[PDB]
């Protein structure tokens, strides 16, 4: 028994809610929050910018040090950094950005990173400003992640569409 509230159960291990992931993280303070990162860990917009802004830019400062030491992530890759005021840890995961010509097949690889963590608060990877079909992202999530994932989808219209079309 954990502290997540108001989620709709989709499968044995996948749950969903129409919520802002930043507000959810501030309220729950989960072990792991997932960031929709890019390979440079440049947190300007979407989930990354909003989490980062909520950390008063401490996430970006930590991220720049990580990149200066390790170089960029791979598309489909991840790294674990601090969750600052929002979570114990932040799992920065790079889904393919369709708007940059990245291979959508890498979305499954991106979701595989979630399997290294027992429980996660996460957004829908490659959705919104990353340019991929959100219904597809949810399908890949359900078919790839085996650990307990609590999904926060910002858009009510999209949330309702995701639930109503879910197989």
Contact set with ligand RJS (CB under 6 A): 20-22, 46-47, 50, 123-124, 127-128, 134, 152-155, 158
Q: What's the min distance (Å) between Cβ of 58 and ligand RJS?
A: 17
User: CA-CA distance, 136 to 104, in Å (whole number)?
Assistant: 10
Buried b (16+ CB within 10 A) or exposed e, 72-99: ebebbbbbebebbebbebbbbbbbbbee
Name the residue nearer to ligand RJS (CB basis): 76 or 123: 123
Work out how close the CB of 88 gets to ligand RJS at its nearest, in angstroms, rounded to a whole number: 19
Tell me whether residue 77 or residue 161 sits nearer to ligand RJS (CB atom).
Answer: 161
- Is residue 112 a contact partner of residue 78, using CB atoms and an 8 Å limit? no
Give min distance, CB of 48 to ligand RJS, in A: 8
């Amino acid at each position: 028994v954990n502290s997540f509230s108001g989620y709709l159960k989709l499968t044995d291990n996948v749950y969903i809610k129409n919520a802002d992931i930043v507000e959810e993280a501030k309220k729950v303070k989960p072990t792991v929050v997932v960031n929709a990162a890019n390979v440079y860990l440049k947190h300007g917009g979407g989930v990354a910018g909003a989490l980062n802004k909520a950390t008063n830019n401490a996430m970006q400062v930590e991220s720049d040090d990580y990149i200066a030491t390790n170089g960029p992530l791979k598309v489909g890759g991840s790294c674990v950094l601090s969750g600052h005021n929002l979570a114990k840890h932040c799992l920065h995961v790079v889904g393919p950005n369709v708007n940059k010509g990245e291979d959508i097949q890498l979305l499954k690889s991106a979701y595989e990173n979630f399997n290294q963590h027992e429980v996660l608060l996460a957004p829908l990877l490659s959705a919104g400003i990353f340019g991929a079909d959100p219904i597809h992202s949810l399908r890949v999530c359900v078919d790839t992640v085996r650990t307990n994932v609590y999904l926060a989808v910002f858009d009510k219209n999209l949330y309702d569409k995701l639930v109503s079309s879910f197989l």
